[PDB]
Write a protein that binds this ligand. Structure first.
Ligand SMILES: *[C@@H]1O[C@H](CO[C@@H]2O[C@@H](C)[C@@H](O)[C@@H](O)[C@@H]2O)[C@@H](O[C@H]2O[C@H](CO)[C@@H](OC3O[C@H](CO)[C@@H](O)[C@H](O)[C@@H]3O)[C@H](O)[C@H]2NC(C)=O)[C@H](O)[C@H]1NC(C)=O
Ligand SMILES: [Zn+2]
Ligand SMILES: [Zn+2]
Ligand SMILES: [Zn+2]
Ligand SMILES: [Zn+2]
Lengths: 213, 9, 212
C-alpha cells in the first residue's frame, strides 16, 4: 500500500521560516504529482499548488505565489513546502496529498499525509478588552464581547434565565469570544445584569454592567 | 497521448 | 475558467439515501476526472471516489460516484447512512493540470429534528467606539444541522472584508451555536446608517437589522 508521512507541528514566532517535509513509500515517487492543500482553523480545504515529480515543474495557486516554495528530493522520495517570513494569516493544518498520473495509467487516488500544524503566534500574554452588548418581546438578550486576548482560557459568569457561551475566534494570533444571557424583559433594565470575565493566564477578572442606551 | 495532469475522460 | 460549486449542507436519517452534488462552471465535467474527499471532524481527509466512480479498497459499495453531462455535474451518493458518514465532502477535478476544489458540503446524519437558528445582532459599545473601533456581534443559537451561511449588509452593500464567523460548535443539547463579528473603524461606523446580519439555514434566511 501507499503512505505519505509529514514533519511534526511548527509552533513559531511571526517572521520565522519553516520547511514541512513529505516522505512517500510504496510507489515510484515520479509516477504521481504531489499536491499541497491547507486548512485554516474551521475553514474548508484551500489548494496551494503541485509538484511535477517527473518534469520538476512547480505550479503555485494565485494567492500562495511569493512566500511559499515547493521542492522535492527523488533520492529520498520526499516533497517539501517552505514558508518564508511567517504571518499569523498563515496559521493552518498544511497537507501533503498525492495527485494524478504523470504517465499513462490509473490508480491515481488522493492519499493524504496526517497533516502538519503550523502556528505563527507572538505567544504574548494579553488581557482581554471587555465591552457590553445591549440592544438598540417578553425576553431581552444582553452580552459581553471579550476581544483580543492570549492564550485561550477565559470563563464568563452572569448575575441578574439561560446563558449561551460562544467558542473563541482566532484573528492575527489574538482571541475574541462572546457570551449572551436571555432574561425576562421585566428584570432588565429595571434590575442589574453584570458579566464577570476571568483570564487566568493574565490573572485579570473584569466585571461589566450592561447599561441601556 | 494525453500530456496534461487530469485531462482525460 | 473552472470553479466547482457545492451546497454547504445536505442531510438525511439513518437508512436513507442522500447525494452530494458539484456543478462544474466554465469547463465540461467529462473533460477531466472527478475525485471525492471525506473529512470527519478531527481526522485528516481520505479519497472515497477517484476517476469519477471508482472506490479505493475498504470503501463500501454504498458510496457511489456518477457524472451527468446534461447538468454538467458529478455526484457522490451514499445509501443506508450510518453515523460514521457524518463528515465534510469535497469534489476535486483538474483545469490546466491544476486542482479545483468545491467549497465542501457537510453531510449531517440526523439524530434530532431540524432547528432554525435564533439570531441577535448587537451594535458596538460606546466604550469600544472611543478606541476608534466598532465590532457588531451576530449571535446564532439552537440550529441543527450545524451549518450556517452568514452575510453582512451595510446600506445594501455586501461586506467581503472585515467579517469573520466561528465554525459552528455543539451546545449541551447537541444543537449548534456560532457568532459572526463585523469590525469597522469608529469613522466607518459613523459613516453608514443601516447594518444587516443575514443568517441562511437549510435554504431559509433570517436577518436582524439596526440603525445608528
Ligand atoms: C521511476 O519512474 C521514473 C520516471 O519514469 C517515467 O515517467 C513515468 C510517469 C512513466 O511515464 C514512465 O514511462 C517514464 O519512464 C523512472 O525514471 C526514468 O525512466 C527512464 C529510464 O528507463 C529514463 O530515461 C530515458 O532517457 C534516456 C537518456 O536520458 C534515453 O536514452 C532513453 O530512451 C529513455 O527515454 C527517464 O529519463 C527517467 N525519468 C526520470 C524522471 O528520472 C525510474 O526508472 C523509475 N524507478 C524505478 C525504481 O523503476
Ligand atoms: Zn503516516
Ligand atoms: Zn525562506
Ligand atoms: Zn480536454
Ligand atoms: Zn439555547
Amino acid at each position: 500500500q501507499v503512505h505519505l508521512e509529514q514533519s511534526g507541528s511548527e509552533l513559531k514566532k511571526p517572521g520565522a521560516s519553516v520547511t514541512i517535509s513529505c516522505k512517500t513509500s510504496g510507489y515510484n515517487f515520479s509516477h504521481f504529482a504531489i499536491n499541497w492543500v491547507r486548512q485554516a482553523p474551521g475553514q474548508g480545504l484551500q489548494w496551494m499548488g503541485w509538484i511535477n515529480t517527473k518534469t520538476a515543474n512547480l505550479t503555485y495557486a494565485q494567492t500562495f505565489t511569493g512566500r511559499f516554495v515547493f521542492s522535492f528530493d527523488t533520492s529520498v522520495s520526499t516533497a517539501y513546502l517552505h514558508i518564508h517570513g511567517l504571518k499569523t494569516e498563515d496559521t493552518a493544518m498544511y497537507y501533503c496529498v498525492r495527485g494524478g498520473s504523470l504517465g499513462i495509467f490509473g490508480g491515481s487516488v488522493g492519499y493524504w499525509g496526517q497533516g502538519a500544524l503550523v502556528s505563527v503566534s507572538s505567544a504574548k500574554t494579553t488581557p482581554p478588552s471587555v465591552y457590553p452588548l445591549a440592544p438598540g418581546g417578553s425576553s431581552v438578550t444582553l452580552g459581553c464581547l471579550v476581544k483580543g486576548y492570549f492564550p485561550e482560557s477565559v470563563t464568563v459568569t452572569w448575575n441578574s434565565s439561560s446563558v449561551h457561551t460562544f467558542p473563541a475566534l482566532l484573528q492575527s494570533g489574538l482571541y475574541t469570544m462572546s457570551s449572551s444571557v436571555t432574561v425576562p424583559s421585566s428584570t432588565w433594565p429595571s434590575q442589574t445584569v453584570t458579566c464577570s470575565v476571568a483570564h487566568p493566564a493574565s490573572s485579570t477578572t473584569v466585571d461589566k454592567k450592561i447599561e441601556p442606551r | 497521448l494525453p500530456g496534461q495532469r487530469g485531462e482525460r475522460g | 475558467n473552472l470553479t466547482l460549486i457545492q451546497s454547504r449542507s445536505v442531510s438525511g436519517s439513518p437508512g436513507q439515501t442522500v447525494s452530494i452534488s458539484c456543478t462544474a462552471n466554465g469547463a465540461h465535467i467529462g473533460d477531466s476526472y472527478v475525485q471525492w474527499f471525506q473529512q470527519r471532524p478531527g481526522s485528516a481527509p481520505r479519497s472515497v471516489i477517484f476517476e469519477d466512480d471508482k472506490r479505493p479498497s475498504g470503501v463500501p459499495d454504498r458510496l457511489s460516484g456518477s457524472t451527468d453531462f446534461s447538468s454538467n455535474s458529478a455526484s457522490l451518493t451514499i445509501s443506508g447512512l450510518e453515523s460514521e458518514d457524518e463528515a465534510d465532502y469535497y469534489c476535486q477535478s483538474y483545469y490546466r493540470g491544476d486542482w479545483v476544489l468545491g467549497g465542501g458540503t457537510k453531510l449531517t446524519v440526523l439524530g434530532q429534528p431540524k432547528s432554525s437558528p435564533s439570531v441577535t445582532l448587537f451594535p458596538p459599545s460606546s466604550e469600544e467606539l472611543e478606541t476608534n473601533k466598532a465590532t457588531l456581534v451576530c449571535t446564532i443559537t439552537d440550529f441543527y444541522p450545524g451549518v450556517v451561511t452568514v452575510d453582512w449588509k451595510v446600506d445594501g452593500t455586501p461586506v467581503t472584508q472585515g467579517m469573520e464567523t466561528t465554525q459552528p460548535s455543539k451546545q449541551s443539547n447537541n444543537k449548534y451555536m456560532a457568532s459572526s463579528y463585523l469590525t469597522l473603524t469608529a469613522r466607518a461606523w459613523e459613516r453608514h446608517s443601516s447594518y444587516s446580519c443575514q443568517v441562511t439555514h437549510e435554504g431559509h434566511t433570517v436577518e436582524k437589522s439596526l440603525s445608528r
